């Protein structure tokens, strides 16, 4: 068959186009898989570092409110100390005047 | 008839050349995209590392400030207790002198 040999070549060319498309799709899939393996460890270390940062930022806010409570507590005690020291001065002054009137 | 056959074999050789150029071009394009993505991930990683360094430094500063405040507060509470006992002693002296006087 002279034309049967020609029809065989046209059949072959259609089959070769199908094979090309399959090989082009397979190369894409293989490259995406290699890519995922390349970024896997880095994506995991990134998510871990974001969560550690979220926890630290949360801890920092708690630390600020603790500092605020401590400063206000300290200011109250420093003022109380001031009014007790002045009470001592007042009492020393009173004691001296009373002591001169007996002695 | 034979020239038409030689034309089909010439065409098939050309289709193979094209498929090969296309296979290479898809790989190069994917590599550019993947390299771009890797650079973005690496950049985000370096900014999370810098944010973590900054947070760890703030955590040290906050915690050390808390530690200093608690120790300062204990010192003042202790000094207050001493002064309060001095007031009690002076009020006792004031009461004994006041009874001898008025």
Numbering used by the authors:
A (entry chain A): -1 to 101
B (entry chain B): 0 to 101
What does the paper say about this structure?
Centrioles have proximal-distal polarity and a 9-fold radial symmetry imparted by a likewise symmetrical central scaffold, the cartwheel. SAS-6 proteins comprise a globular “head” domain at their N-terminus followed by a long coiled coil that mediates stable protein homo-dimerization (Keller et al., 2014), and a disordered C-terminal extension. The characteristic shape of the SAS-6 ring led to the proposal that the protein head domains comprise the central “hub” of the centriolar cartwheel, with SAS-6 coiled coils forming the cartwheel “spokes” (Cottee et al., 2015; Kitagawa et al., 2011; van Breugel et al., 2011; van Breugel et al., 2014; Yoshiba et al., 2019).
Recombinantly produced fragments of the corresponding coiled-coil domains were folded, as judged by thermal denaturation experiments monitored by circular dichroism (CD) spectroscopy, and formed dimers in solution size exclusion chromatography–multiangle light scattering (SEC-MALS) assays. We succeeded in crystalizing a fragment of the coiled-coil domain from each species, with different boundaries, but spanning approximately the middle one-third of this protein region (henceforth, CrSAS-6_CCMiddle, DrSAS-6_CCMiddle, and HsSAS-6_CCMiddle; see Figure S2A for the protein sequence alignment, Table 1 for a list of recombinant protein constructs, and Figure S1A for SDS-PAGE analysis of these constructs). As the HsSAS-6_CCMiddle and DrSAS-6_CCMiddle fragments did not originally include methionine residues, one or two amino acids, respectively, were mutated to methionine to allow SeMet incorporation. The HsSAS-6_CCMiddle coiled coil is distorted compared with a canonical CC structure at a region N-terminal to the site of SeMet incorporation (indicated). Both the HsSAS-6_CCMiddle and DrSAS-6_CCMiddle crystal structures revealed primarily antiparallel associations between their coiled coils, with only much smaller parallel associations between coiled-coil copies, which were offset by approximately one-half length or the full length of the crystallographic c-axis, respectively.
